[PDB]
Ligand binder design. Sequence first.
Ligand SMILES: [Zn+2]
Ligand SMILES: [Zn+2]
Ligand SMILES: [Zn+2]
Ligand SMILES: [Zn+2]
Ligand SMILES: [Zn+2]
Lengths: 265, 263, 329, 185, 109
Amino acid sequence: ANKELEEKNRMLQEDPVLFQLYKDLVVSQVISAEEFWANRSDIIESIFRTYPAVKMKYAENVPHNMTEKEFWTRFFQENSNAAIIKRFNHHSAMVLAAGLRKIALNLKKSDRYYHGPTPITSQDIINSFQSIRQEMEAYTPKLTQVLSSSAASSTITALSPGGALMQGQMVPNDIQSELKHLYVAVGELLRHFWSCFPVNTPFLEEKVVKMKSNLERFQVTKLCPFQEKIRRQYLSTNLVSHIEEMLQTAYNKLHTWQSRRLMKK
Amino acid sequence: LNLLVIVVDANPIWWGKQALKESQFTLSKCIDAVMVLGNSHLFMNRSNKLAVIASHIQESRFLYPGSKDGKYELLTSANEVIVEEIKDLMTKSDIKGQHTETLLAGSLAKALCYIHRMNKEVKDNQEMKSRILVIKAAEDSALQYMNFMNVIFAAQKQNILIDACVLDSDSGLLQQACDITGGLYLKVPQMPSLLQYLLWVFLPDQDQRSQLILPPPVHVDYRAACFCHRNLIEIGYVCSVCLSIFCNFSPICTTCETAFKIS
Amino acid sequence: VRLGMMRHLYVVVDGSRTMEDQDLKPNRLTCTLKLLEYFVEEYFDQNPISQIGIIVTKSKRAEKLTELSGNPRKHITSLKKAVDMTCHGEPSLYNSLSIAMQTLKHMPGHTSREVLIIFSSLTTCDPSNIYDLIKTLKAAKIRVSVIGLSAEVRVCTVLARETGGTYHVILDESHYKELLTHHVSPPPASSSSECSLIRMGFPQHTIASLSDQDAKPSFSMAEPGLTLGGYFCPQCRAKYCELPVECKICGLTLVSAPHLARSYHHLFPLDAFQEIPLEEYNGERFCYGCQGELKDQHVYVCAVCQNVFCVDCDVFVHDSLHCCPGCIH
Amino acid sequence: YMESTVASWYEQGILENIQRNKLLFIETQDGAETSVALEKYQEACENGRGAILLSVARGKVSEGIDFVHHYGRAVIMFGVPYVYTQSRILKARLEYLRDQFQIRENDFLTFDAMRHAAQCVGRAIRGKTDYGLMVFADKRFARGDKRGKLPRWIQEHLTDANLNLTVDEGVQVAKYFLRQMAQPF
Amino acid sequence: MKLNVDGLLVYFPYDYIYPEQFSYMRELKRTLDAKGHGVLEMPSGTGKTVSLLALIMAYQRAYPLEVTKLIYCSRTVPEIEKVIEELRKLLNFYEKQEGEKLPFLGLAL
Ligand SMILES: [Zn+2]
Ligand SMILES: [Zn+2]
Ligand SMILES: [Zn+2]
Ligand SMILES: [Zn+2]
Ligand SMILES: [Zn+2]
């Protein structure tokens, strides 16, 4: 059946983001669309489920020279006393049937955590210890020793923006939307490209997807510079170099791992 | 109110080396700068309280829980206790060649619980904004990373700042702490002018720190290294038990002893 | 006991009408939402590598309120929005569990799958039988630990014990915080549960090289403006605003060094301190931890350092700091 | 009487609200209907639906069935169980007990109801200390004579404070009671 | 879990007995010692049969000539079926303590 066609129509306009990027892969005629998707009331309903007799009646009494309002009228319509008990037990039984479809841890080296991932004679201790011991026998020099006009002033100058220890542009905005669209464009297609890359997949069926994806990387990126060229040749300002890293670094991973494959063979 | 806490790193080996070097900067001046820094804080408002803590290779001791000179009487008591207490700690101390690196995580642990002890005591009417003005003066200890890392998170949970003011050596671990908890960092190169940095950068409280221009945060290199080598690694491998950064793939990680199954 | 360092927990909340009833001080639905925010905020604060996903089941339908994520702010925002939720209908446990199972079915083996169901209305109308689902969960090694509200319902009683989880009921609002707070800690991994190594990458924060030379402009990765600097990836090379976020491309978890060090206190739990009220030759009037006078006949000590800690210090050390101050020395 | 009560609830929205809250089952004279309904009831408790099984105290179903943990959690005794006094057979039995052995006509009649009311409601506590509450929906039971005929274990636990609980007040304490029993030992 | 009742020592399979059980056995023994018909009430449906049965087993061994056989009746056969299970469990516990078969027979008509 044409299940895919119906799904596309539902998402044709309901959600822009999903369809917006899918077309872009075909706007420039990059690759076939087959690989795109291949890789990636209540009251009447209750009576419909609850009472089998109504279900049978509805099929046999399907609207024919009648009205739904008239059908609604038919719903509500000592021996009579027993009917309520039988109906409720039957009704309760039907509802019930309706909802029933047929290690102590241990370690060898805990010191490693104490000196964790963060990376990096004897007489000197004695000599230093004694010298400091006799240092503070004179104390409370606060009057002048703590600060001086020259020393204090130098600190203020350093704290100024020009001074040391105090080091200290949204011009493009319309272009921002295109980059975000491009960013989603790269992310949407990189995801599939990186979907199988981390896993080695030593199998032809899984590896074939890698080759198709690996070749597809060039195809999607073949058209990328063309869009880049137009944007770049505007004011030569606010260069977009990050977007290149993902593609170039994707190439390097592709080329390196592809080269590694030959060595393994 | 604010509860400042000056965790001074009074390491005799380092401060003693300065005495042997006969450099202009000396510990006595540093304590005076801390003293003047401490006095100014309380001096700002009556409700403020402070505390001072030292550090040593052996153990760290609190330096703090008429007007003969003419200064405020309350500040007179603080100077006496701090002046006498520090001299006792420095003059009296044992010798241990095996342990010579200053301890700071332990001293902080005494600081973090002090606010919580003080936070319970303070009445419900008044809300307190505590802070820790750690003043590092020596290199960090390798074996203290895990212990120091726990205290920092405790500070973040309780919202206590760690305004590290390290000097003479940029402590890679300490500069990490001030970032996590929102505290400031500053590597003062003009040690004689240390105090003027304090009155400017560190003295203002958190509620006022925002409405003020201060030196921009320094880049913090959150390096991760394998447990084999202690070399920076960008892609790390860990297990769901050790939670240990490891160098490369292994059939089983040593620290775990788990019967890891290939797949 | 070895714990599940990385866990994927779902906080299923019932949108039942019974939540409308106010047995507690505020509206029951608001209270759970108010307190659930504490768990969500605290859940990541004590397990960064983990991730959470909330589900709300109302009118016999289970709708994923938020998918699995590592940002507590995003989840908390949904909680604020859900405060004004209609809360009219009947929950369906089968619908809720089925929704969680689909998402959690594809999760990696190393992670410890979990579910936390806040049950309010004792009734559970479901499209199909749940015992078949219960069997699937055990084969799916999903730990379902219901937290009932005002009912020791049998259906959930088997669910927690049969599936390996824990069942509880809210004695009162104060007791409610204790129950959820318990689930914050990584539940121990049982014999059936297994473990495996997980690949991760540490994103070095980077900024402009030298005065905007060879700059790296970019906006974000999930109205974000251009950013001078941001976290990159060993493989994505994508600018991530904040960490820890799973690679939107690689699928590999990115996490800074401190976050991993955050959970080490779980591996090395601090041994409790014996409580002796009398002085017992303790000549230090001031507490060692806080240098404060002991106004109570209570003391705590370690088995190695043998120091003195008051009630305030011991309460603090075992609550937040997760380490002994003096015993570090 | 049960049918009249059911019919009155059916005409009103009370029964529909009860149906929404939980499934409801009624009992009939025929055993086959009772057997099927009872089996469905046990299915409801196993699942989360729950079931409200309306029965007659003197019906064969009550004596035959046994209620255990998560079965008949809150046994409800709607009115004192009494037989149609017009029954001559009962009168002859009742009359003789008054004629001989010196038993008052009302004393035995109350005794039969009290012994029978306790018979059906005492199953919820079968064993293994499985929590279960018993509610008597009649002011008559509060009378000293009724309590005296009540079994010791049920009687002594019952206190005067909760003897005359209001319908909504009784509901609240029942909710509190479940909370305490819900938590483990 | 042997119980040293005032009348004699009575074997008991389960771990613990509530204080009411202590009263139950001694009260039953009083009537049995008097060899007179009596009536008593015990709330628990389960554990009452074993406590009732347990004393009889000890009483029979202590005074086999006093009592010939035990006739324990139940209202409904579905309920008597579970009763014999309690007796079967008790017999295994009592037999295990002795370590050998004993001249004891139990059946339901
Ligand atoms: Zn290595
Ligand atoms: Zn390990
Ligand atoms: Zn990545
Ligand atoms: Zn203390
Ligand atoms: Zn200790």
